């Protein structure tokens, strides 16, 4: 019926957590980040060259070994617990992740590999991979996107190698956790690690854009780094975040067996960066086959500056859909998964526009506005109407909604 999922050779029995769609599974193994002459592959290769050629360390440049072919199938221990993410944390919700079952999932971030690669004794590495998230539908969100993770560890004498009294300064102490440092980190060590992290990323961004770009650092929170930041780029008059980063939580680094090391880590969104770097308006464009988009990244070398040229934009068709919710058996993201399945890359966005409760029946009603717009052509009213009608019938069959229309 709907038991057992088979993926990349292996078999995953379904259960109460399982919520993959066939549609999302058809994207696993595509590995756009590894597809020669794809925009995302291009960014990856330029980041690789920056760390192989331009990073500089007081000892030597750390060798950043590159892992761009790790399977996206991970345990919840890799994806969450290894990163100190609490058991009650909202990032674990079934509404937000693609679970194969209670124990295996599609990784929601490339940070799901930090512990394993630290555990193998690496001091510096890059991880590049497709990641998976259940979320809303708009031009900035897609069920699969791509991240590049970097981790860089320091020994005590390496970090203090430029100073005249180095072997009396230390990495570790026992004090209190502040806005600026972890409880077991010295302020001396954190200031140097933070400086190296931000200098590295600032130079990487100048390597990718130019020297005129406006960036800012925004303090934020992650369970697996502290202090932590998001880097934001000002683009089309708006500050857009492109990465998260910070000083790695020492419990994580210690638990992987690197107890004599302090580190930084960052994770950048390749689509978010690519959309700024090349002015790409819609994330669906990374997945189309229109040569008008694809050929622009086929360049002679990975440093030939591609000057992406805008595509024509086609008119939209807007249709509403209203139904009564099942009696306490419904998630917004379930409907978005269904729209992706039926509507696919015809759908530009979905907004929940209205909700209310009916007193006589106690039923909740949702109304969603669906914006149909194709990236490659004009849609006819007719094909959209039939697709929209098919969506309504699938919604009744599969989600147990009650058509209100
Ligand atoms: N994993 C974070 C990014 C990040 C990576 C490494 C350190 C800190 C933050 C995300 O997906 O948003």
Author numbering: 11 to 415
Quote what the paper states about this structure.
Among the recently reported pathogenic variants are point mutations in FARS2 gene, encoding the human mitochondrial PheRS. Patient symptoms range from spastic paraplegia to fatal infantile Alpers encephalopathy. How clinical manifestations of these mutations relate to the changes in three‐dimensional structures and kinetic characteristics remains unclear, although impaired aminoacylation has been proposed as possible etiology of diseases.
Here, we report four crystal structures of HsmtPheRS mutants, and extensive MD simulations for wild‐type and nine mutants to reveal the structural changes on dynamic trajectories of HsmtPheRS. Using steady‐state kinetic measurements of phenylalanine activation and tRNAPhe aminoacylation, we gained insight into the structural and kinetic effects of mitochondrial disease‐related mutations in FARS2 gene.
